[PDB]
Amino acid sequence: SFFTKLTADELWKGALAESGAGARKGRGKRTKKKRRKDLNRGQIIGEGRHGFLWPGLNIPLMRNGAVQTIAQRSKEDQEKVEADMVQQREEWDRRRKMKVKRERGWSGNTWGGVSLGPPDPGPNGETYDDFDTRILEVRNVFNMTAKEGRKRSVRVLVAVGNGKGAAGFAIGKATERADAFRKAKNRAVHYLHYIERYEDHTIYHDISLKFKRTHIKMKKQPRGYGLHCHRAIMTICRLIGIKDLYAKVSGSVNMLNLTRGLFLGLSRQETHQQLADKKSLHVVEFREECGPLPIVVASPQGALRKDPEPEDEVPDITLDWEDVKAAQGMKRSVWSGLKRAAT
Amino acid sequence: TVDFIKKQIEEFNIGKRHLANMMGEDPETFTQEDIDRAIAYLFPSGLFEKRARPIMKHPEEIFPKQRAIQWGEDGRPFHFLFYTGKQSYYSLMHDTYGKLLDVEKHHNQLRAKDLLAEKTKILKDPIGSRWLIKEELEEMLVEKLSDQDYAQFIRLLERLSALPCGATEEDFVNRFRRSIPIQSKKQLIEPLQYDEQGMAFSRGEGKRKTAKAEVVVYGQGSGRIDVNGVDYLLYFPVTQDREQLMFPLHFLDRLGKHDMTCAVSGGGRSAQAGAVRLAMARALCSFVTEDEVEWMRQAGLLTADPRVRERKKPGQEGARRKFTWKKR
C-alpha cells in the first residue's frame, strides 16, 4: 500500500478545496473553514520515534577527535523529546489562535474611518511617512457578465492627509479588497489639494454650497470648541489639520458627492489676503473677547484706496432659514444640544 | 545588458576553443557547421522540434537584438524623437520623407534646367524583388510595429521609388529590397542510358496508393509490355486498367514504338495501374522533347497523386462518418 499514497501538496489541495465550485461564484462561506498547516516545519530530519541517534543528521561527526558510533537514546529521553515536540505544537497553535485586534474607525464592522498607514512610495524614490490615509466608504459593487453572471467588484474611497493643510481623495476599484485598498492609496497621492486654514485651525469664512444634490454648509468657529461635523467631514478635517468647524449636510448624504462638494467648497475658499488685494482696502478683525481693539490681519499691497465702501442701510444678502431659526432661538430640537464624545 | 552580451561573446570564444580541443581539429578553421555536427554528436537529442535541440552559436544570433540606452546620466534623451514613443520607426519615416523632398527639389531643378537624366529602376522583376516582411522590418527597427504603419511605410517607399531616381536614394531603397529564389516548375530531363549494345532505354519510378512501380523502356523494339514476367493482357484483365497503360503512349502517338518491362509491388489492380502509368510517364521524358514534356505536365501525367487513405478516428466509423447521433 506504499505505492497508493500521494504527495502532501496534492493532499492539501484536495483537502482545502480552494479550487472548488463553491468558492467560485460566492456560494461558499456557509459552512466552510479549512486550515493549512505545514507538517515539515519542526523536523530535525534524523528524528525518529524509535529514537536512533545518527552521526550525521542528529548529532555531529566527531567527538573528542574520535568517530562516534550509531547509538540510541533512552526511553525517558524519548518521552522528553516527544514532549518538547508536542509542546512546540501547542505553542504553534497558541500563536495561531491569537487574533490581532482591529481598530474601529466609526463602527464595529464597517471600514469607515479606518486608517491604513502611510501611502506607498512612488517610482522616483519619494517616501511619504507624514501622510495618513483613511477609508470613508467600502461598498461591494456587482456587475453582470456573460460567463460568470454576477461579478463582484469592491470599490473603496480613501483620503490622504499629512495634517499640514495638504489633503486629497480618490476611489479605487478591484476584485480583491486589498488590491482596491492599494490602488486607492496609490491614486490618492496623485490628486492633492491645499486647504487654507485661518491661524492653522479653522477655515477663513462661512461656506455654503450645493454640489449636485448635496447641500453642505460649514461654519467658522473660535479656538475652544472643536469639530461639530459629520463623521466623514471630521475625518477629512483631521487629515487636513482643521480642528474647529461646524458642518451640516442636507439632501443626499452620499459619500463621494459629499467629499467632492467638500473639497470644491474648501478649494473655492477666499483668504483675507485675496480679499484685501481685490478690494484695495484694509480688513479688520473685531474679536469679541478682545473688546473694541481693531486687529488688522491683512493689508492691501499696492495702492490703497481712499474711497470708503458704500454704506447700505439694508444689505442685500442671502439668508438661510435654519441659521436665522438658530439665531432666534426657535430651534427646540432635542438633538442639537446633545453632549457627545471627544473629537 | 551590454556587459552580459560581451561576457557571452568571450565565453563563447573560450568554449569554441575547448570544443576544437576536445575534437582535435584546427581551431582557426573551426567553423559553424563544424560546431553544429560537433554538438549533434556530443549531445544527440532526438526531438521532433528542431529548435529544442542543443545549440551553441554566436550570442548575437541567439540573443535578440536589444534597445540601447535612450538617455544620458542627466536625463536628456539622445534621439530627438524619443517622446513620440517610436523613435526608430518615425526617424525612418523622417529620413524617407526627407529623401523624397530632396528628390522632388532636384527634379524641379532639373525641369527648370530642362534635363531628364534619371531612369525608372523600380522594375526589378527579373531579379525577383519583394519588399520587407513586417517581421523583418521589426527585426531591422528592433521594435514592434503595426500593419497600418507598415502599409504607410511601404506606400511611402513606392512614392519614393516611382519618382526619378538618384544613386543615394536607390541605395537607400535597396536596403529594404529582398530577392526571391528561382521560380520554375521545369523538371530535370534524365539523360538516356546505353548499356551492353542496347540503345535508348530509360528508367522510371511511379508511386500511387502504396503501389511502387519500376518501368524500363526500350525505344528499339515493337509495342509490347512485360509486367512482372507475364504479359500485360494477362496481368490486367480490366479494360480501364489497360487504358491507363495506354494513356501516355496514345498521348504521345508512340503506341507501338516502345518495348517495356515492369516491376510493380503493393496495392490493388487500379493502384498498380496508376503507378505504372506514372512510372511510364516519368520514364518517357528522356525520349520526348521539352514542349511535349510541358504538354505532358498540363495533361497531368507527371504529377504524383497525393490521394492516400486517411486514418480512422476514435469515436468514428470510417474517418468521416460518426456514429448515429441521437437528439434525445
Binding site: 506504499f2 505505492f3 499514497k5 504527495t7 479550487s19 515539515n40 523536523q43 530530519i45 545518527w54 552521526p55 550525521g56 543528521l57 555531529p60 561527526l61 | 537529442s45 532526438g46 526531438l47 521532433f48 522540434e49 529544442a52
Partner: protein, 132 residues
Amino acid sequence: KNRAARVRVSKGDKPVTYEEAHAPHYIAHRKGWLSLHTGNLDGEDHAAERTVEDVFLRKFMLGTFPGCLADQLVLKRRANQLEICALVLRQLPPHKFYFLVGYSETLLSHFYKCPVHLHLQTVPSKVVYKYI
C-alpha cells in the same frame, strides 16, 4: 478540458519549471523522458518490474530529500547499473548530503541487487522557466 500533467493559469505570479510548463503532448517534441530504460522497446521483455522500480525510486527520493528536492528525477538504466540524477537545493549541510548519498547508495544496491549511482547537482533555488 484536458487536465493531465498541466499547471493552471493563475494571476501571473506562480513560478514554473520547464517540465511542468509543457503539456504531455510535448513529450519527445520539446521535453524528454525522465526515465530511460530498455524494457519499453518493440521485442523486449520486463517492462513492469522496471516501472514499479521507477515508482518506488520517485517516492523514496521525494521522501528522502524532503523539501530540498527541487524537481523530478532522471533515472538511467545502462548495463544493470542504475543512475539516479537529482537537482537538490542548498538547504541541508554537505555532511547530511554525503550521509544520505552513502545511505541511499548502499540501501538501493542491496535492495534491487544491482549497482547504483547517485549523481547530484545542488542549486540555490527552484529553476524558473516562465511567469514570475
